Design a protein around this ligand. Structure first.
Ligand SMILES: Nc1ncnc2c1ncn2[C@@H]1O[C@H](COP(=O)(O)OP(=O)(O)NP(=O)(O)O)[C@@H](O)[C@H]1O
Ligand SMILES: Nc1ncnc2c1ncn2[C@@H]1O[C@H](COP(=O)(O)OP(=O)(O)O)[C@@H](O)[C@H]1O
Ligand SMILES: [Cl-]
Ligand SMILES: [Cl-]
Ligand SMILES: [Cl-]
Ligand SMILES: [Cl-]
Ligand SMILES: [Mg+2]
Ligand SMILES: [Mg+2]
Length: 544
């Protein structure tokens, strides 16, 4: 593998939740160890599972991984780090300012952005400690900071300006500006740091990666490698029609890699039978080769009961929000109700369903513009740039799009309104303090659906979203598990072994996460036409 040749002291892996960053990290950690290299593995995942995969406990201290000499691990809890980053700001004014104030400020430091800043604070600590390179040849992280987080800490304005929004965490950095600059310097030095983009052979995921690559490159990380994981081996597309549909779809994308990623050194890893759980299984990865859950139609029949309501589909990026939102809207309309679908991405398209397409790009720009008259007013040029970078945050689009959607939320009364994306609980809370919070919290009026995948990480990320939404008083009405192989028509041995891997995930969702659940299958054909869109739903036998 190219990504394993001549690794510098710092190696970071980046990619969406569940692409296999941690798995690949662990795998590489061993590979390097057995070549006689001293390796430090840094787990940075919310609820780390690296200790488990290595059958031991790890902690905020460097410990040896007895099951593989030459290797050691260290866990950096992001949640714990964020908690203490917030406390480091709030505790000092606790008791000097009123409670409702300390309360608001605390919320201002409970979003994804604070977590990102705090993680960067730990990364910097590691990156700026030479001694480590005295004890190790390689320090591997299973996640990487985003371009946004890097831009923010490299702005002159972040140090010389103050703003009357997610800039709150910035006053939490206690290290000198020089260390943050040193870190960024190390991340941009191809001699010290290699960035590995992890993706899948899915037209869509590649689009996101190509994007991350440009952002990180412009910033300075030009030592990048592409690792396409979970690829389906042709020696499987034989016999079973499903596997065949897939294998092509990938060979298709694989062959049409977005332009930007083309010039990137690339390696592909194979879809494995069982989800790794040991040195043996992990090592394999680097080589060269039905549940009792109702159909989506069942969820829709119960959403149809009231004959009206706001249907909001939520979840992480790529889990299929827009597709579930179109399937539901299409089904509701064919059941005879006036349905108004709202999307934030170009799709397509009886006269019972009307579709509103909003362009997040222009919505975001109207919003950014609006905030630059309000706040930018007395800021100096350096500060305006800090403000424009904060408005480059994930939630800026999130907020802007939600305000565009709100334009129609009014009709949730006469009919059904289906949306394919929503702001986080934290963001809803922020907007509330400044906007139909009451409507959203009402269980009769709104029905929030959480879309996720039958995989370990996507379920955890979804659980966390629900937890956040719950702090805002919104309780998801049901969960939709997408791309399921269990409920899939397949004679393909690997896909069957794969479908069997999903069971505990799907079981978790029904037993511990959702009031209601829907199981959708891996279509094996892009649900582009309302034809295949109607196929996702399945069927619900009428009863009394
Ligand atoms: N059940 C499915 N079977 C096969 N393909 C699917 C399924 N659900 C979604 N997809 C495909 O996966 C892609 C990504 O899902 P999509 O519905 O766009 O995501 P989303 O979560 O709205 N995206 P984003 O708004 O970008 O986070 C689409 O191109 C789909 O056709
Ligand atoms: N090529 C692959 N084939 C089969 N399973 C994989 C592959 N890559 C990862 N997985 C399995 O998938 C989940 C995806 O997870 P993971 O590495 O934890 O990463 P992350 O969330 O950091 O991207 C795990 O349950 C894992 O053991
Ligand atoms: Cl945030
Ligand atoms: Cl935040
Ligand atoms: Cl941020
Ligand atoms: Cl019925
Ligand atoms: Mg991970
Ligand atoms: Mg979408």
């Amino acid at each position: 593998m190219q990504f394993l040749q001549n690794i510098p002291p710092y190696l970071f892996f980046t990619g969406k939740g569940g692409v296999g960053k941690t798995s690949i990290s662990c795998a590489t950690a061993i590979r390097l160890a057995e070549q006689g290299k001293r390796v430090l593995l840094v787990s940075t995942d919310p609820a780390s599972n690296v200790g488990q995969v290595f059958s031991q406990t790890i902690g905020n201290t460097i410990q040896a991984i007895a099951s593989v000499p030459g290797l050691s691990a260290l866990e950096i809890d992001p949640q714990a780090a964020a908690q203490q980053y917030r406390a480091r700001i709030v505790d000092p004014i606790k008791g000097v300012l009123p409670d409702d104030v300390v309360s608001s400020i605390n919320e201002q430091l409970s979003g994804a952005c604070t977590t990102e800043i705090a993680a960067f604070d730990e990364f910097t600590g590691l990156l700026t400690d030479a001694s480590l390179l005295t004890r190790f040849d390689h320090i591997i992280f299973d996640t990487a900071p985003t371009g946004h987080t890097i831009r923010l800490l490299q702005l002159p304005g972040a140090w010389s300006s103050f703003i009357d929004s997610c800039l709150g965490p910035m006053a939490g950095l206690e290290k000198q500006r020089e260390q943050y600059a040193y870190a960024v310097e190390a991340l941009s030095d191809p001699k010290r740091t290699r960035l590995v983009l992890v993706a899948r052979l899915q037209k869509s995921t590649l689009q996101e990666v190509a994007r991350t690559h440009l952002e990180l490159a412009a910033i300075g990380l030009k030592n990048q490698y592409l690792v396409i994981n979970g690829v389906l081996p042709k020696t499987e597309a034989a016999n079973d029609t499903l596997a065949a549909a897939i294998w092509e779809r990938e060979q298709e994308a694989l062959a049409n890699l977005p332009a930007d990623l083309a010039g990137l050194p690339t390696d592909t890893l194979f879809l494995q039978p069982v989800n790794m759980v040991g040195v043996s299984a992990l090592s394999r990865l680097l080589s060269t080769q039905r549940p009792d859950i109702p159909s989506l139609s069942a969820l829709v029949d119960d959403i149809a009961r009231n004959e009206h309501g706001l249907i909001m589909l939520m979840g992480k990026g790529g889990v299929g929000k827009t597709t579930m939102a179109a399937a539901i809207a299409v089904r509701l309309a064919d059941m005879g109700f006036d349905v108004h679908l709202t999307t934030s991405d170009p799709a397509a398209h009886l006269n019972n369903l009307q579709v509103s397409r909003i362009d997040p790009h222009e919505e975001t720009e109207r919003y950014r513009q609006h905030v630059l008259e309000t706040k930018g007013k007395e800021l100096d040029e350096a500060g305006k740039r800090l403000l424009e970078e904060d408005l480059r945050s994930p939630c800026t689009e999130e907020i802007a799009v939600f305000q565009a959607f709100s334009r129609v939320i009014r009709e949730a009364g006469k009919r059904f309104v289906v949306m394919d994306t929503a702001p986080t609980g934290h963001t809803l809370l922020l907007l509330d303090a400044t906007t139909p919070m009451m409507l959203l919290q009402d269980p009769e009026r709104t029905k929030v659906l959480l879309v996720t995948l039958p995989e370990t990480t996507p379920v955890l990320e979804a659980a966390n979203l629900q937890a956040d939404l719950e702090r805002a008083g919104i309780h998801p009405w049901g969960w939709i598990i997408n791309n399921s192989l269990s409920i899939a028509d397949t004679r393909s041995p690997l896909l069957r072994m794969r479908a069997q891997q999903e069971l505990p995930q799907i079981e978790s969702v029904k037993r511990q996460h959702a009031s209601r659940v829907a199981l959708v299958p891996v279509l094996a054909s892009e649900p582009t036409g309302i034809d295949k869109l109607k196929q996702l739903a399945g069927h619900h036998h009428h009863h009394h």
